């Protein structure tokens, strides 16, 4: 919403990040991953950043969420394919709002390569095609 929950390792369900302020997304990766937090929260705060009106830090913090597919998660690789299809769609979406400086391929390369790892685990998603 404006503050959803980030679970801890010990005495979980205690800490919050209020989204009315804008923290940097890289320290978010940290404060999530010292807590071995489930991959679902990475999608949830990505959606929080997107509903906060962000398309680029939103799409680059999830690149740091591409590392932790099944880190301590007990088969949340379904959650990693959901993570990676978001970049496979929003790299190619942010390539359409291209600017004067980069190329379209400057995002299409990352979209196409990450899609290949997206199809390593799962085939013919409703977003793969």
């Amino acid at each position: 919403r404006g503050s959803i929950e980030i679970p801890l390792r010990d005495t979980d369900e205690v800490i919050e990040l209020d989204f009315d302020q804008l923290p940097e997304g890289d320290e978010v990766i940290s404060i999530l991953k010292q807590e071995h937090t489930q991959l679902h929260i990475w999608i949830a705060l990505a959606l929080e950043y997107y509903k906060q009106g962000k398309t680029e830090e939103f799409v680059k913090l999830l690149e740091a969420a591409r590392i932790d597919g099944n880190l301590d998660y007990r088969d949340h690789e379904k959650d990693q394919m959901t993570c990676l299809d978001t970049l496979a769609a929003y790299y190619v979406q942010q390539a359409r709002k291209e600017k004067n400086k980069d190329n379209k391929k400057d995002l299409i390369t990352q979209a196409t390569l990450l899609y290949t790892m997206a199809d390593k685990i799962i085939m013919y998603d409703q977003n793969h095609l």
């Binding site: 959606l47 978001t86 929003y90 359409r96």
Partner: protein, 48 residues
């Protein structure tokens, strides 16, 4: 022969042939909409 003016210029103008043309809208080739199944976080299909 007649000494015709070289008609290198438009003053009639061609505006009858011009504003009769209705102009296409091709700003975005998929017709001005971002095509996405992820940004519908909301849905009106719920009540109501």
């Amino acid at each position: 022969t007649y000494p015709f003016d070289q008609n290198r210029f438009v003053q009639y103008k061609a505006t009858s042939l011009e504003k009769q043309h209705k102009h296409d809208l091709l700003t975005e080739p998929d017709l001005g909409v971002t095509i996405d199944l992820i940004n519908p976080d909301t849905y009106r299909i719920d009540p109501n």
